[PDB]
Amino acid sequence: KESKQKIHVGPGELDDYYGFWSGGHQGEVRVLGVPSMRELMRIPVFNVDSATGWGLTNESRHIMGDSAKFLNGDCHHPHISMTDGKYDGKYLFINDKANSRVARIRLDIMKCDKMITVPNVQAIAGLRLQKVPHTKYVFANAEFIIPHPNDGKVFDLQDENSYTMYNAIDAETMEMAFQVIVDGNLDNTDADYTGRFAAATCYNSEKAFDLGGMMRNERDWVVVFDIHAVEAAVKAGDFITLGDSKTPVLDGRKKDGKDSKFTRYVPVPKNPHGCNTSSDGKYFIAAGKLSPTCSMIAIDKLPDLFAGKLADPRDVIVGEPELGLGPLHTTFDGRGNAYTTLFIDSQVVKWNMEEAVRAYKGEKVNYIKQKLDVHYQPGHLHASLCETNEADGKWLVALSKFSKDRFLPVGPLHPENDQLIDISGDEMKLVHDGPTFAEPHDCIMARRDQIKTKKIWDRNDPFFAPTVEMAKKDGINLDTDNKVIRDGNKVRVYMTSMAPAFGVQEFTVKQGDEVTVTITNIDQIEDVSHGFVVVNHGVSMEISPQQTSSITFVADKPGLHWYYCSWFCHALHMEMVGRMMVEPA
Amino acid sequence: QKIHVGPGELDDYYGFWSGGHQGEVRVLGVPSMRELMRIPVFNVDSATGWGLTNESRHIMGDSAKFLNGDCHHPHISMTDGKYDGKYLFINDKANSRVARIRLDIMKCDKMITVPNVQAIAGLRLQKVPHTKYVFANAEFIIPHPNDGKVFDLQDENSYTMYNAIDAETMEMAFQVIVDGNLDNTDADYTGRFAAATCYNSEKAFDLGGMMRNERDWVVVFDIHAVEAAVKAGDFITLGDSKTPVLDGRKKDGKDSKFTRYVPVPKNPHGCNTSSDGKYFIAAGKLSPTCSMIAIDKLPDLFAGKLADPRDVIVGEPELGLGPLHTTFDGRGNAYTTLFIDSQVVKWNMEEAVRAYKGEKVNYIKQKLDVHYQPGHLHASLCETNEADGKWLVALSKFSKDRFLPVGPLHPENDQLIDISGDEMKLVHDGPTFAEPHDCIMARRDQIKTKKIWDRNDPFFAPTVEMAKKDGINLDTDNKVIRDGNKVRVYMTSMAPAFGVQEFTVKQGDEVTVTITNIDQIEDVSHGFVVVNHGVSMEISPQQTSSITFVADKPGLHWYYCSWFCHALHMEMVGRMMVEPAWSHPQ
């Protein structure tokens, strides 16, 4: 009954959980140890990472596709793939609001391995994964209403071909599965524990562009998706396509008051934000934001709603507790309590879901258990394993936007305050203030035993298989060869590396040549990573044990130009260098 | 000594970590070791728009075309041997730059590509009477000119140079040609002398060649002689650079006026001035030693009063395998990393000096195991005459099993060690990304920051001048200025509203958006992102920020505020409407 968990992870001790933090406007994903809250690793995704060369290497730019031209991202929602309502540790997915992308991270290597630009939408916000029977789909919200086509003839958001869409990506192939046109817009989303239903909040049911217009409606809604019905329509070929994308597009809008078979619109106050599935699978809980409430949709009633048995879509609302000012997000301890951020009141409120349901019926019962002050203005919060039926009720992180005086001053820009709260007992206890850069917004925690990683690369890894293919065309055995291939004004250097020596320590090219350098790290000892930097050429990349990495640049400067290993790898690290000699034109 | 900083408590020191090949500078609270801020320098930062905004690309100059850096050595400006908290400087080995960070705004405000060199490694600041010069090493020998006619490092015109940058103007002050090459460097407590380690006295390019000589050296610089030669006009220039270049190489075994070469084993690395100003201490690396150069013997060495440059060595303690770096507790002890033995060794400098004279004494006080393979180490205030002997950070290169597994790439292990007492105590393992090389710690009361920008800050003064040419008052105006195929949008922002919430352009127009954050409440930052155009920047209270992009896509394109600023933040958005090219002249 007492919240008494230990927070200190001393030298030589290990954390109990992995934390996966969104990088916010900075674009990466960050791996933390919990409860120490120390950052263990940064995984580049939408950012360009000077250290590993993500965004510069051929392997990374191949994964990014055309979107490799962008140097920014804005991510919010990191989530781990599931099997039977539990994390399976295979993949992490995350959104990019800035350039309308979804990325996939492979948790065995802790790298982004797939990326997709969602077609015919703007701004991927809410993102969550199918839970049951497993993560077949990644569900993603496109936040902003746009014209279709967006060819510059029509700009009116109220035109009948202006709308946004709910997006489903095939988690395993990272290709679009389908899109569903909706009324209004989309904010956050979550999925049930059966695979049939998903739901999303909408704050712009008004289809307005101005602040006041977007707050005009007493109620917006959460739109519920009958995913089985969508899938059936796709299997039967009953869909359209938009523009030059082959993605099946289904119309989920209400037409002359008549409901689609793919959607129902449940009225909810007001400009709601969070959309959170309780761990017992009973509820979609929408945070009321402008309304000081959360609304509880009984997932049990959704079949009746779509079958036309209910006289009113509000009939699926079974609770609407009053909690405080500015409810934004909800999480669960698995013991029957919900925990909700109050942005305005600057608190986390713990409340009992079944008691709120009884109060909605008129029973006099206080469902509120505790309000804990947080510092300050909390956005999202996350309890350990809360997105699974294994929600364990141990740790809670509340991610607050204004850190004010909680840390040393560091200039006009301030850190986020991610506060660790012990929820193992009856009383929430604040135990740690964690400053973070660039507004992570949301995070996710997994048990140590849910994550299994590779100590060294497999030579057949798909991450650099296209580079292995290029090498094959050149007759190159990457595991052994140190050779320079000349092909017109193209030069392809292939080399092994073994601390403390590059396998090719000098090569000569002609000014203007396009040079590709492919390096295979044939060290077998864990942690013996190498780097490759070409001085004054903007070239930098990582090569970890048994990885092949490659990078392309033009030798636009005559003369002698040094390259060196950037990753401290050996006592003779500083002498691990080579020379590119560039003959003048 | 308090180790843990609980909720609502503040750290006692600022830590400034280098970002290594990730390219940024990181601000930590010490002793919590939590990262409080990232300061982009050579990296492109999606969050603040550094490398994307016009203000940042102006500071970076032509080097804005590079997306990478490799920084090692962050150091704070000094007055009379003490931190004054004005500036932090750092190197870029990848693209041969030095950057200046202003500590009041915690932003890079100046950057310079060092001319006619490759790879800025070691960097240190003049201590006395203040930081007039930033001293920086160019690590790699190159031909001069480097035009592709000569590649041979043995050519009489192949060399590297020592570099002095004017700390206040961030322009080159001078360069000194040296024999061998340059690694790390430090400066004395008088202003006359600086010193640097050399590991490639052989001028080789292969591993064996670079390891051939039993001793390389530390080259000592007589800055007073350099300055006097510059004022006398006795110098040359290289290429198109106007920087005074002085020749500090030997000529047929005869010394120049500017340099002396002190033989030191072997491929030495660290070059550290003791806090009492007595010694330059060189870490022997391949030699299991450190070599102590008595700074008060330097005047005699430069005046020819000594028969052998080795005569300025007054200690060479044997310490262990792979000495890389030394720091100081201000109590007469030195602390040295042993990369191979994977330890920090605490030793007494005066007793090492007496053991050098033959007197049998054990100057080694303790060896603490670290995990694993330490590179540099830093004691609090160690680079100043206020070295307070409280905290030590050792930065280890192989973390192995000290943290949860995270795949083939591992974090570094920066370990906080309590040195307030006679015995070193390991207290905290701090994992860090991308290999910080050095860090620096400053007392909390040595750093003073602003919470609100001044409207005349030089950081964005070029943007203010741009606005003035358009007749714009940035504090108030919400206007769209049109100029051919250029559109310049000026707007204020006040949560939760952009001052200009929609504007219309032609397909192909080059659009500049300038935003002034006119909120006065601290911590109320705004952002600006144009969806699907690769555009992102921060605007903090009273800052002006601007960014330029091509409106290459017809149709409606949303922009939004990225920094959570207000309960209605999600609704702080705007719309750019792009009329299609086929409806406008071709």
Ligand code: CUA
């Ligand atoms: Cu390879 Cu350092």
Ligand code: CUA
């Ligand atoms: Cu301005 Cu959020």
Ligand SMILES: [Ca+2]
């Ligand atoms: Ca609304």
Ligand SMILES: [Ca+2]
């Ligand atoms: Ca040597």
Ligand SMILES: [Cl-]
């Ligand atoms: Cl949510």
Ligand SMILES: [K+]
């Ligand atoms: K390392």
Ligand code: NA
């Ligand atoms: Na893709």
Ligand code: NA
């Ligand atoms: Na389109």
